[PDB]
């Protein structure tokens, strides 16, 4: 629409579809991190890197669990953040007034003649 209402801009509509890697990147990233961290420990102790896979599974499992938990909390923090902005906009409609959208017909800015 021709209007610039800041509250409209913030408000979601559900049109956006989050990417495929979005709901899995933090779990999978931590899971790989846990395993890789376990790989150092054996290497640091000059043990066969895949010896004692128990520790790999634990670190991988612990990584996934922690990743999912913190990812769950992340969205609440983001959801709350926009909620704050939307509420603050509503309280001060004067400081965020609706502005009209100019088009290039009604403006004359400079250009840079390279020559």
């Amino acid at each position: 629409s021709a209007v610039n209402d800041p509250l409209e801009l913030l408000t979601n509509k559900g049109t956006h579809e989050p990417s495929f890697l979005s709901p899995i990147w933090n779990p999978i990233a931590c899971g790989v991190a846990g395993v890789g961290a376990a790989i150092f420990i054996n290497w640091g102790f000059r043990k066969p890197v895949f010896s004692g896979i128990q520790k790999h599974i634990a670190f991988g499992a612990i990584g996934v669990g922690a990743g999912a938990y913190f990812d769950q909390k992340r969205n609440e923090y983001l959801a709350k953040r926009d909620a704050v902005l939307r509420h603050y906009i509503e309280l001060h409609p004067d400081d965020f007034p609706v502005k009209e959208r100019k088009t290039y017909g009604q403006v004359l800015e400079s250009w840079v003649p390279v020559r």
């Binding site: 610039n4 959208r101 290039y104 017909g105 004359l108 250009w111 390279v114 020559r115």
Partner: protein, 151 residues
């Protein structure tokens, strides 16, 4: 074939032409299949002037349209150059009288080309080209056509 060599010349041209025409007619053409290919058509899209200053898709729409039109306009000059190119070769030694109109068509096109896309350099885009026009027109009504100086 009034000349001796020209009589020998045509003999060779029969030798090099004879097989290839047969080969074209015997193998290549008869064995091929029928198939048609078409020509892209682009629906005209809104110019940059209609675009708002905050939306990027509409600007992106026009920038690509401007660029495609630039190519068409870059080489419509190229075609006109090739005409004066070809007339000079097909009309010599008396080519000045005949190429002179063609070059007149060419030089006019270049100026219109240079009035539109000229002096923008690379990164020229719909916004810049349109804004050159706005500044050009303002100067025209105030100082008259360019080349006459200011008042």
């Amino acid at each position: 074939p009034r000349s001796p060599m020209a009589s020998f010349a045509e003999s060779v041209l029969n030798v090099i032409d004879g097989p290839i025409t047969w080969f074209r007619e015997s193998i290549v053409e008869p064995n091929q299949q029928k198939q048609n290919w078409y020509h892209q058509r682009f629906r005209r899209v809104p110019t940059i002037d209609q675009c708002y200053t905050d939306d990027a898709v509409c600007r992106f729409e026009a920038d690509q349209q401007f660029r495609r039109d630039r190519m068409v306009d870059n080489e419509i000059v190229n075609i006109l150059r090739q005409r004066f190119e070809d007339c000079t070769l097909y009309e010599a030694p008396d080519h000045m009288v005949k190429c002179r109109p063609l070059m007149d068509q060419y030089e006019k096109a270049t100026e219109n080309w240079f009035i539109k896309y000229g002096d923008l350099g690379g990164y020229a885009n719909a916004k810049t080209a349109y804004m050159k026009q706005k500044h050009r027109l303002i100067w025209e009504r105030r100082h008259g056509p360019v080349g006459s100086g200011m008042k």
